[PDB]
Write an enzyme that holds these catalytic residues in place. Structure first.
Site: not given
Length: 655
Positions: A9, A96, A98, A100, A311, A313
């Site tokens: 991502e 990722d 998740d 999304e 990370y 974010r």
DNA sequence: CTTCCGCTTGAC
DNA sequence: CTTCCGCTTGAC
DNA sequence: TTCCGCTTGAC
């Protein structure tokens, strides 16, 4: 031959992963989403331009079939990935884990259409054991997971592109409504009318210097009026009496020794702040280190790229076992044994396994700031300041509570036929707390002699509730479950672009059109603007991803209405189409664009009307001939909604 | 003709 | 030079 | 259209 293409991502993870893999692997980034629905009917391909569902971009008549296009800001990314696909033999979709990230992997599969083998894998950190484990446990795509976010995406499209035309028809063109926008705006509007109806109530007391400062507590049999004694309308909550300017100054009395009634002592315990997230880091970075929000992220990107921190974010403040043990082991060896908590302290938040972890130093053995100061200096001094800030809150989050002791003295004094009462609160640090890394005399025996040195009439006044700031607003959104870290900054800018919220210093001030749009959505789309709508939506998205509900059946219930399937608020009420249909036909536009404020002395209403050239204050009054010819005055944005009292209303009408 | 939420900012 | 103002956070 | 904290203290 024998090369693989790994797609992630974020460009940062792409760079860090490329450093751990070397040759034989090509690590690239999708820059997030590569595909989306068309933003407009003029963006759909020529095949569906005439179809009526082109305005939505999904064919709601045919089982909600979405139409995806390559995002124009991602064409450069897509073309590079397509070019690099022709140079490798395997594709690793490593977005990722998740919903999304699973859809990005799904979109990458659909857009690239690769003829080589594809493996789907997930990792949580860039470390050799995390890469190896992810590589030795691949899987296929989870369609129930991609159907979850697709239901969410289409939900947001139906919400926005169907309720916004209602606003164009009843308020003003180009206005908008969204599952997040309209709630974020409502939060700010609700705050504004809470301070429009607010009424102040002043009171006085005495706060004299009897290195010690004591204040009024009671006077004779009654107490003294405090700030916590008046309600929103200036009414005293049902004993006490408010000392005004006249009566308090009469009790000022020259120099007199004051007695002491009580000096009890009791200890407290101060808790350490939890580790940092992307939101809480920029707050402290802009406070104790005076850094910008974008300057903090830019620095935090480099610390993570060099393996200093994790990370950046993250909407999570929890710590891994390796991190919770490294922090507790470092703290114990650094300071002392009793300087740690008996059990590790876990800081978990809502929206519960969240793959994200708090911002903390990297490695299974933390590095002291002293160890990296010799490595970070010169043009890298700003980098070391952020690391020390990150390291300090990480190790302090694992040490024993800061213990202190507060001394609540009670000063006594007389004044004629009234035994007034005084008191003061003190505090001193008795236990060396977490603050060591980062975060005259007060002794008096009951019944001593202390004369009054100073004397002053303490002027006070109750204040309306403060307006939201960018920091406090996203906090309210966080506790409600609204929005995401990537959209928090974006949703603040969007509600300003269409003139829903303007900024005065750090406070967010709503415009008048925000009042009109909120009023419409509160009186006619009450379910879509409910503060709980997103949470209830998330609970239903869990069942779609778990396999207990299909995407089509949920959307069909939400849009056309339905009782069968996972129960939904809008579904059981007839659906979104029936609700926007009724509101397009039953809403009186001449009523929703007239914001009622108050009546003047003649008992006649004064409105704020949202016109084509901004808001204007209007009132209906009898004219020369005894008929209701009206009075208007253009409303400049120089006065906020709560500042528009009856006077300035009449001052603009007198202009 | 408007309008949604979400996703990332490397260096080839 | 001679020009001006939302106090917000959160102690214990 | 230059530039800005601390002291009280929500709970």
């Amino acid at each position: 031959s024998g090369r693989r293409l790994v797609i992630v991502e974020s460009p940062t993870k792409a760079r860090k992963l490329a450093s751990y893999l070397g040759s034989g692997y090509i690590v690239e980034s999708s820059r997030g989403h590569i595909r989306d629905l068309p933003r407009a009917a003029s963006d759909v391909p020529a095949k569906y331009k005439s179809q009526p569902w082109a305005r939505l971009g999904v064919n709601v008549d045919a089982d909600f079939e979405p139409l995806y296009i390559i995002s124009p800001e991602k064409r450069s990314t897509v073309s590079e990935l397509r070019g690099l696909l022709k140079d490798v033999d395997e594709l690793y979709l490593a977005t990722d884990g998740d919903r999304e990230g699973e859809a990005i992997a799904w979109h990458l599969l659909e857009t690239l259409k690769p003829r080589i083998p594809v493996k789907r894998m997930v990792f949580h950190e860039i470390t050799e054991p995390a890469i190896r484990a992810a590589a030795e446990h691949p899987r296929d795509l989870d369609i129930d997971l991609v159907d979850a976010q697709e239901t969410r995406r289409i939900l947001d499209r139906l919400y926005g592109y169907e309720v916004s035309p209602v606003l164009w028809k009843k308020v003003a063109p180009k206005l908008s409504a969204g599952r997040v926008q309209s709630v974020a705006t409502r939060i700010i509007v609700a705050r504004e009318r809470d301070r429009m109806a607010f009424r102040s109530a002043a009171y006085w007391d005495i706060l004299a210097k009897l290195t010690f400062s004591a204040r009024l507590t009671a006077v004779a049999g009654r107490r003294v009026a405090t700030g916590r004694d008046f309600d929103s309308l200036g009414t005293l909550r049902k004993e006490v009496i408010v000392l005004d300017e006249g009566s308090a100054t009469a009790l000022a009395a020259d120099g007199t020794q004051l007695t002491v009634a009580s000096a009890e002592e009791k200890p407290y315990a101060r808790r350490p702040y939890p580790p940092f997230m992307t939101s809480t880091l920029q707050q402290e970075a802009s406070r104790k280190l005076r850094f910008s929000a974008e300057r903090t992220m830019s620095i935090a990107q480099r610390l993570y790229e060099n393996g200093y921190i994790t990370y950046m974010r993250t909407d999570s403040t929890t710590l891994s076992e390796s991190a919770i043990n490294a922090a507790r082991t470092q703290a114990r060896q650094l300071y002392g044994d009793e300087y740690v908590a008996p059990a590790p302290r876990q800081y978990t938040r809502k929206v519960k396994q969240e793959a994200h972890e708090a911002i903390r130093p990297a490695g299974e053995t933390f590095a002291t700031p002293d160890a990296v100061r010799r490595e970070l200096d010169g043009p890298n001094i700003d980098d070391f300041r952020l690391y020390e800030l990150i390291w300090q809150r990480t190790v302090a989050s694992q040490m024993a509570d800061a213990r202190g002791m507060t001394l609540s003295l009670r000063i006594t004094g007389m004044s004629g036929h009234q035994e007034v009462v005084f008191s003061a609160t003190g505090r001193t640090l008795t236990f060396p707390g977490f603050l060591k890394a980062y975060v005259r005399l007060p002794h008096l025996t009951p019944g001593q002699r202390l004369d009054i040195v100073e004397l002053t009439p303490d002027g006070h006044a109750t204040n309306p509730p403060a307006r939201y700031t960018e920091a406090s607003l996203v906090k309210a959104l966080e506790e409600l479950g609204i929005g995401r870290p990537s959209t928090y900054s974006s949703i603040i800018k969007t509600i300003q672009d269409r003139g829903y919220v303007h900024k005065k210093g750090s406070a967010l001030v709503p415009s008048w059109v925000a009042f009109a749009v909120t009023g419409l959505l509160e009186q006619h789309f009450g379910r879509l603007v409910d503060y709980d709508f997103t949470a209830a939506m998330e609970d239903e998205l869990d069942e779609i991803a778990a396999g207990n509900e299909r995407r089509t059946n949920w959307l069909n219930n939400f849009y056309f209405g339905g009782d069968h399937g996972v129960p939904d608020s809008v579904a059981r009420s007839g659906g979104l189409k029936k609700l926007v249909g009724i509101n397009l036909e039953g809403i009186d536009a001449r009523e929703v664009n007239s914001i009622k404020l108050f009546d003047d002395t003649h008992g006649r209403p004064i409105y704020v009307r949202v016109g084509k050239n901004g808001p204007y204050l209007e009132r209906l009054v009898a004219g020369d001939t005894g008929e209701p010819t009206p009075q208007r005055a253009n409303l400049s944005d120089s006065i906020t909604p709560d500042e528009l009292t009856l006077q300035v209303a009449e001052e603009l009408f007198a202009t």
